[PDB]
Amino acid sequence: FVAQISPQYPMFTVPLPIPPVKQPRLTVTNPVNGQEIWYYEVEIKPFTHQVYPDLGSADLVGYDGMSPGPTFQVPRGVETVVRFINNAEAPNSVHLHGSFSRAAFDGWAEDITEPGSFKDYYYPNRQSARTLWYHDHAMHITAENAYRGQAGLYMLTDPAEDALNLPSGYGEFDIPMILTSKQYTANGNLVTTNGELNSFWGDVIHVNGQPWPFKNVEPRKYRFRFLDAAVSRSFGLYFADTDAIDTRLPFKVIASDSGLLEHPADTSLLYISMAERYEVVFDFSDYAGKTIELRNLGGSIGGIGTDTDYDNTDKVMRFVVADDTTQPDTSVVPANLRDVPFPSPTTNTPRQFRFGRTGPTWTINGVAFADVQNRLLANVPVGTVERWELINAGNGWTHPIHIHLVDFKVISRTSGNNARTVMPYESGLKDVVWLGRRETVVVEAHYAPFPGVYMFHCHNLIHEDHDQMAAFNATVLPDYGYNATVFVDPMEELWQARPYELGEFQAQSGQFSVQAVTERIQTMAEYRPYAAADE
Numbered sequence: 001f002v003a004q005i006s007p008q009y010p011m012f013t014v015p016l017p018i019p020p021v022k023q024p025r026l027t028v029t030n031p032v033n034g035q036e037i038w039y040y041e042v043e044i045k046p047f048t049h050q051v052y053p054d055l056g057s058a059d060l061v062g063y064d065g066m067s068p069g070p071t072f073q074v075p076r077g078v079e080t081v082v083r084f085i086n087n088a089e090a091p092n093s094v095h096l097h098g099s100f101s102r103a104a105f106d107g108w109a110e111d112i113t114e115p116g117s118f119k120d121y122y123y124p125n126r127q128s129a130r131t132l133w134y135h136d137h138a139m140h141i142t143a144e145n146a147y148r149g150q151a152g153l154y155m156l157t158d159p160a161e162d163a164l165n166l167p168s169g170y171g172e173f174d175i176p177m178i179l180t181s182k183q184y185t186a187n188g189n190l191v192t193t194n195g196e197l198n199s200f201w202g203d204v205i206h207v208n209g210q211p212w213p214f215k216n217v218e219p220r221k222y223r224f225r226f227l228d229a230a231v232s233r234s235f236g237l238y239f240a241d242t243d244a245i246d247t248r249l250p251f252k253v254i255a256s257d258s259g260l261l262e263h264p265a266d267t268s269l270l271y272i273s274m275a276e277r278y279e280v281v282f283d284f285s286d287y288a289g290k291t292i293e294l295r296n297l298g299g300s301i302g303g304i305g306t307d308t309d310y311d312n313t314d315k316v317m318r319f320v321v322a323d324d325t326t327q328p329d330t331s332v333v334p335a336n337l338r339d340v341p342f343p344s345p346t347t348n349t350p351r352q353f354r355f356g357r358t359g360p361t362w363t364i365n366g367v368a369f370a371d372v373q374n375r376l377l378a379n380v381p382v383g384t385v386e387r388w389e390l391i392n393a394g395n396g397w398t399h400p401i402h403i404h405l406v407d408f409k410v411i412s413r414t415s416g417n418n419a420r421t422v423m424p425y426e427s428g429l430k431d432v433v434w435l436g437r438r439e440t441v442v443v444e445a446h447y448a449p450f451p452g453v454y455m456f457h458c459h460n461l462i463h464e465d466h467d468q469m470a471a472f473n474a475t476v477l478p479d480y481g482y483n484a485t486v487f488v489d490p491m492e493e494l495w496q497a498r499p500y501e502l503g504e505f506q507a508q509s510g511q512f513s514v515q516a517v518t519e520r521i522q523t524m525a526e527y528r529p530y531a532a533a534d535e
């Protein structure tokens with residue numbers, strides 16, 4: 001490893017913070033079905049926070065002026081409208097990662113909101129229970145917007161999964177674990193990602209926005225919701241007793257990007273790359289009175305990646321395990337979690353997408369996103385199941401690939417270094433898959449249920465910004481209906497950002513009056529954006 005560049009930090013001295021739950025402002029009755037739609041207001045604004053206790057503070061920009069943004073908790077079947085208000089200094093575009101939103105509510109990179117404007121995002125919340133996350137996607141400034149704080153968690157819940165009796169209680173035994181990797185100046189401010197064209201690895205590991213924290217835990221089971229929200233750093237996570245720091249302790253993975261696995265996957269090492277979500281149950285029962293360190297495999301994630309490793313990037317956080325529990329642990333991890341809704345399999349030859357570099361620019365089949373005339377790389381009729389072959393021929397870089405709209409099954413992985421194939425925790429449904437060194441992955445997806453133009457890209461945010469993103473069009477015929485003509489173009493004027501005055505927001509009047517919000521949402525709802533999922 002390489003010497004740390006950021007100032008020395010007081011390791012494992014600050015408790016793991018938990019982002020607060022985001023509460024809706026009000027609900028609006030949907031005239032179509034008489035259901036309540038939950039309406040939220042999120043203010044994107046600059047803020048500072050004192051990351052290094054004995055230095056200066058860091059400049060950030062976040063949802064509701066915090067990083068991570070607040071955590072949404074939404075039950076399946078409840079539609080939501082979130083008004084993302086830009087009261088900051090650069091444009092934004094919000095992507096709810098994990099949601100089959102319509103194209104104009106999906107965070108298309110050109111679909112920006114300027115400072116002094118807001119955009120209303122209408123979300124369906126119909127998919128399987130899963131850990132989604134919302135984050136910036138504005139063209140060519142995504143890495144810095146995310147880095148400086150525009151990412152938060154969004155939990156879609158299902159009461160039918162209650163009976164599973166998994167470890168529960170947000171911030172109690174259900175713990176968000178948002179990972180980031182950054183670098184700090186000598187006075188404790190952030191080093192900018194601007195100017196970086198290869199990757200911004202970072203030498204300070206954060207969980208939920210906090211460098212190298214600790215958490216006091218009871219000797220029992222916890223559900224951890226891991227999310228790699230870093231700009232460029234991938235992880236190989238493992239747990240180890242501080243008395244045997246090299247010995248990986250077993251745990252279970254219970255969910256991936258799109259929701260629960262069919263069965264828990266017994267795991268001692270969890271590969272997790274940018275934008276991937278995995279939910280883990282760890283049992284601290286056997287480690288009462290010990291300290292368990294969450295660590296990160298070195299040698300560039302054990303040869304799967306190419307990331308630079310530093311003095312302390314092998315460390316994530318510490319769990320200090322109590323002698324005994326306060327209450328008995330009545331939670332379980334069932335052998336059978338759910339039936340996973342895999343798409344009907346196809347034998348058609350996969351579509352092929354090569355992720356590489358064309359000179360300094362990161363590209364897809366030699367194309368960059370700025371190239372408007374060539375960036376639409378696939379037309380797929382709505383309802384088609386397709387396999388895509390995702391190729392990383394290079395040994396010098398890696399790419400976690402995200403395909404919007406869909407959930408996909410990971411069919412195969414080859415490695416030119418023979419390092420791995422499909423992992424056990426990739427057994428279910430995902431929407432990001434890591435192309436490690438010399439890896440080719442085939443995925444299978446139902447391109448459904450909504451027509452429109454959607455993105456796919458590498459989710460290394462440096463690669464993404466420069467310029468590794470393309471589009472596909474999920475297409476329908478002229479007689480399809482469902483108001484498709486106003487929902488296929490992500491830049492559709494009907495759904496564009498709107499200017500606001502700060503005073504009317506603060507006074508909750510005008511555009512922000514109960515009447516105006518109610519009427520705006522009821523009118524949106526009349527277009528019935530998500531009806532095709534209700535067949």
Ligand SMILES: *[C@@H]1O[C@H](CO)[C@@H](O[C@@H]2O[C@H](CO)[C@@H](O[C@H]3O[C@H](CO)[C@@H](O)[C@H](O)[C@@H]3O)[C@H](O)[C@H]2NC(C)=O)[C@H](O)[C@H]1NC(C)=O
Pocket residue numbers: 376451452453473474475476477478484485486488
């Ligand atoms: C993505 O695929 C869309 C189809 O799902 C496609 O939208 C379709 O575009 C065609 C051609 O512009 C439209 O066809 C008709 O449009 C006008 C209006 O009536 C007619 O005068 C024309 O002669 C033509 O027959 C379709 O109406 C339209 N379909 C929908 C549902 O909007 C998009 O163009 C594709 N997007 C990209 C970027 O390629």
Ligand SMILES: *[C@@H]1O[C@H](CO)[C@@H](O)[C@H](O)[C@H]1NC(C)=O
Pocket residue numbers: 481482483523526527528531
């Ligand atoms: C399309 O939107 C219009 C305008 O809101 C609405 O009146 C109509 O019912 C919608 N039609 C469908 C098929 O969703």
Ligand SMILES: [Cu+2]
Pocket residue numbers: 095097135275402459
């Ligand atoms: Cu994402």
Ligand SMILES: [Cu+2]
Pocket residue numbers: 355362398399400458459460463464468
């Ligand atoms: Cu990449």
Ligand SMILES: [Cu+2]
Pocket residue numbers: 095137402404455457
């Ligand atoms: Cu994206």
